[PDB]
Amino acid sequence: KVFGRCELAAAMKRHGLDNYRGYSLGNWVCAAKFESNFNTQATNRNTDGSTDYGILQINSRWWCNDGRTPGSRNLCNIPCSALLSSDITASVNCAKKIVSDGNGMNAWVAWRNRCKGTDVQAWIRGCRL
Ligand SMILES: [Cl-]
Ligand SMILES: [Cl-]
Ligand SMILES: [Cl-]
Ligand SMILES: [Cl-]
Ligand SMILES: [Cl-]
Ligand SMILES: [Cl-]
Ligand SMILES: [Cl-]
Ligand SMILES: [Cl-]
Ligand code: NA
Ligand code: NA
Ligand code: NA
Ligand SMILES: [Ru+3]
Ligand SMILES: [Ru+3]
């Protein structure tokens, strides 16, 4: 599913991501924009052989099981395919664990490079929330 901008903001808020660990909703929408262009089915292979899955491009090295990432963990206790669903619950619940791991949203390199320090509220501007 390809979410609209405000549609995704609303879904993220319903699932408790707004201000989670102090990160306002626009941070999460901005991250999803640059990770996946709001497409739940996005996948991308990393040089190390791991793969990133879903709207927030969550990586099989640590967070989900795909059966094809040697030596990896599955800290969210989910198949990576669950991160591709039109229902964002699994992605949100796993993102909550990731953002709590110590480095906040810097875990998403694209958030650090493209969202951090910017006017992230623009990503939710105009949305009925
Ligand atoms: Cl957009
Ligand atoms: Cl915001
Ligand atoms: Cl596993
Ligand atoms: Cl594996
Ligand atoms: Cl594990
Ligand atoms: Cl599994
Ligand atoms: Cl949803
Ligand atoms: Cl933080
Ligand atoms: Na939804
Ligand atoms: Na894994
Ligand atoms: Na749901
Ligand atoms: Ru930890
Ligand atoms: Ru860690």
Curated annotation (Swiss-Prot):
Coiled coil: none annotated. Transmembrane segments: none annotated. Disulfide bonds join C6-C127, C30-C115, C64-C80, C76-C94. It catalyses: Hydrolysis of (1->4)-beta-linkages between N-acetylmuramic acid and N-acetyl-D-glucosamine residues in a peptidoglycan and between N-acetyl-D-glucosamine residues in chitodextrins. Its EC number is 3.2.1.17. Substrate binds at D101. GO terms for cellular component: cytoplasm; endoplasmic reticulum; extracellular space. The active site is at E35, D52. One of its GO terms (molecular function) is identical protein binding. Keywords: Allergen, Antimicrobial, Bacteriolytic enzyme, Disulfide bond, Glycosidase, Hydrolase, Secreted, Signal. InterPro entries: Glyco_hydro_22, Glyco_hydro_22_CS, Glyco_hydro_22_lys, Lysozyme-like_dom_sf. Its main location: secreted. In the egg white and polymorphonuclear leukocytes. Lysozymes have primarily a bacteriolytic function; those in tissues and body fluids are associated with the monocyte-macrophage system and enhance the activity of immunoagents. Has bacteriolytic activity against M.luteus. PANTHER family: LYSOZYME C (PTHR11407:SF28). Lysozyme C is capable of both hydrolysis and transglycosylation; it also shows a slight esterase activity. It acts rapidly on both peptide-substituted and unsubstituted peptidoglycan, and slowly on chitin oligosaccharides. This is Lysozyme C. It comes from Gallus gallus (Chicken). The gene is LYZ.
